[PDB]
Amino acid sequence: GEELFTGVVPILVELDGDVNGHKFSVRGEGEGDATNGKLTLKFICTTGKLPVPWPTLVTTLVQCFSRYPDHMKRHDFFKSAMPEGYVQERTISFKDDGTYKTRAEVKFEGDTLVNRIELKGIDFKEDGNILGHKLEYNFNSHXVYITADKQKNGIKANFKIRHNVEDGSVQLADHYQQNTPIGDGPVLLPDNHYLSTQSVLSKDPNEKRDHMVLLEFVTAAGITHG
C-alpha cells in the first residue's frame, strides 16, 4: 500500500479513554507526509480537562507515516497492510505507577487515514507523576525496536519512553506492542530494525480548549544497505 503515501494524506484520530474511572475523549486532525517521515496534528480534549498529561498519550495517538529508506522498503509492514489497515495493541507500564492498555484500528476511511483507539488505565497514584500532572510538556527522541511475528502474520515492537519530570527525574514508560493486519491480502514481514523518532509539543495561542499541537519526524534504520 506504499502508493497511498507518496503525497500528503489527511489524518483523523479518535480516542475514548478511562484512567482510574475518569472518562475522557480526544479528537485530532492533521496530515502525514511519509516521503519526509513528517506528522503535523492538533488534538483537543472533547470532555473538558484531560485527566492525564498530554505527553503520556503521544505514542497512543500512525507508524505508516514513518520514512522507510529505499533499501528498507521490503521491511515496511505498516504501509503494506493499507488500505484495509491493521490492529495495534499495546500495554504501557509506567514505572512505579499505573498501566495503559490500548487497542486501535488504523485504516483508510475514503482518502483519510483514521486511527480509532480505546484506552483503559488502572493502578495509577493520585500523588504520582501522571495523575499529579508532574511531567514536563515536551517529548524525547526514542530507540522503536520492531521484529516479525510470523505466527500472527504481523509484527511486535518493544521500546522505552522517557518522560521528563518537573523535579529533574525521568518517568519511564515501557511499551509492548503487537500489530495484526485487518485484511487477508499479503503483507511485508520485516527483518529486525527500529524507528528513530523525534517530536515537539506546543500550544495554539487562540485555542481555549485543553489541547496539544504535535510535530513528529520518524525514519526507519538498523539495516545496512546491501
Author numbering: 4 to 64, 134 to 298
Text taken from the publication that reported this structure:
The encoded, site-specific, incorporation of ncMs via cellular translation requires the creation of orthogonal aminoacyl-tRNA synthetase (aaRS)–orthogonal tRNA pairs. Here we break this deadlock by developing tRNA display, which enables direct, rapid and scalable selection for orthogonal synthetases that selectively acylate their cognate orthogonal tRNAs with ncMs in Escherichia coli, independent of whether the ncMs are ribosomal substrates. We build on these advances to demonstrate the genetically encoded, site-specific cellular incorporation of β-amino acids and α,α-disubstituted amino acids into a protein, and thereby expand the chemical scope of the genetic code to new classes of monomers. Moreover, we build on our advance to enable the site-specific co-translational incorporation of selected β-amino acids and α,α-disubstituted amino acids into a recombinant protein produced in E. coli; we produce milligrams of ncM-containing protein per litre of culture, and solve the structure of a β-amino acid-containing protein.
